[PDB]
Amino acid sequence: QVQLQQSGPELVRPGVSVKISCKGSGYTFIDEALHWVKQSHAESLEWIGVIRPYSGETNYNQKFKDKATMTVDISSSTAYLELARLTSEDSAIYYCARDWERGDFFDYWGQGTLVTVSSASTKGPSVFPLAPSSKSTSGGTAALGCLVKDYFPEPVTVSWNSGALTSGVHTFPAVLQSSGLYSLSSVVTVPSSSLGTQTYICNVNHKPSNTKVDKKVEPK
């Protein structure tokens, strides 16, 4: 079916430009307009503009025209959004979206691209075990986890057993530490009897540092 695949998260220094992308598949790319939408804390959802690949026509929200530029590569089925002279107010999730030819409303959305504008350097996470013990058992269930510490920028993704374990998993929202680095934990509750038969591995991926780390969490 119709899919909009966006490029990964980006850390950008203030005053530097960034170009993010959106690849469409599952339809005739040239025939359909693509829209860009910003989502931030301060201003919620805001429409940035629309590009029509078939004609090359572009239209901008007047608020965004100065700093945003839309382009497309029809051969690679990819639309691009360039954002210039970034400031902290530009830190946001940016979506591309299709309309349903019934006006400017959006039936298919990309997964979003997180842009962080900051002077702080990229740092990949340190991943430590939260080992199950008797101090983390409750009847026939034990809690265990991974501490994903000291990284920048957001986001990280965490899975368990390469996605084979999803039930009972809680991955906490990251918190910004006094150091200016993010930290989070991901935890899971499992049968205490499985602790000797099934191994538990957390898979921690931090795209801005191009790191993937797998940590086996065992009773200490």
Binding site: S44, G103, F106, D107, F128, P129, A131, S185, V187
Partner: protein
């Protein structure tokens, strides 16, 4: 530009009950009004277009009505998985503009947290820092008070909390509280304790360990 005003900002509703969300436009927008649902960590999802038409595959419990400036989104019988921020959006005048969102929160019975404590790993101590993690699992309501004691001394200014979004199936929350100490300070003390106060508990619950 056309300003879209959503009310309420927040609502708390029990499963099976009705949700009514209103969107008001700064000028007439005909029937050019759309409603989206946005669940945590996801892109918005189209539910209602042309003010009152259900988009493809959208359940019958979701409806929209209105014309002009005053619009209504309804969940007739809300389900636990319907927790989300709902947005209205006009596409009558350029630029298309969105309302500020309504966050739909689920009410359920009180559930006490299960509390677990985690010492720092030996691997971490090598770095000169120790993190102690206190986990409160699967509780309701979100309101909770968590305190740290180190050799019975109350800690202040060296811990941070994180809370999950409400679970889409059981409507509960989980919370972490993380205490950050230098390795030196961690090694100077013996008893590490996390104290949890919650409505589902008759008195506070403490989980602790002894270093070593």
């Amino acid at each position: 530009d056309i300003v879209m005003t959503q009310t309420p900002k927040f609502l708390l509703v029990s499963a099976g009950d009705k949700v009514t969300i209103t969107c008001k436009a700064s000028q007439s927008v005909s029937n050019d009004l759309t409603w989206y649902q946005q669940k945590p960590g996801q892109s918005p999802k189209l539910l209602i277009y042309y003010a009152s038409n259900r988009y493809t595959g959208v359940p019958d419990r979701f409806t929209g009505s209105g014309y002009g400036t005053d619009f209504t989104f309804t969940i007739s019988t809300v389900q636990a998985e319907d927790l989300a921020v709902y947005f209205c959006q006009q596409d009558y005048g350029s630029p298309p503009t969105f309302g500020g969102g309504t966050k739909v929160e689920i009410k359920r019975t009180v559930a006490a947290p299960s509390v677990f404590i985690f010492p720092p790993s030996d691997e971490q101590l090598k770095s000169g820092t120790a993190s102690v993690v206190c986990l409160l699992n699967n509780f309701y309501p979100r309101e909770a008070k968590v305190q740290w004691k180190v050799d019975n001394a109350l800690q202040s200014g060296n811990s941070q909390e994180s809370v999950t979004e409400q679970d889409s199936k059981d409507s509960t929350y989980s919370l972490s509280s993380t205490l950050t100490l230098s390795k030196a300070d961690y090694e100077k003390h013996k008893v590490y304790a996390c104290e949890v106060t919650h409505q589902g508990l008759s008195s506070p619950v403490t989980k602790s360990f002894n270093r070593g």
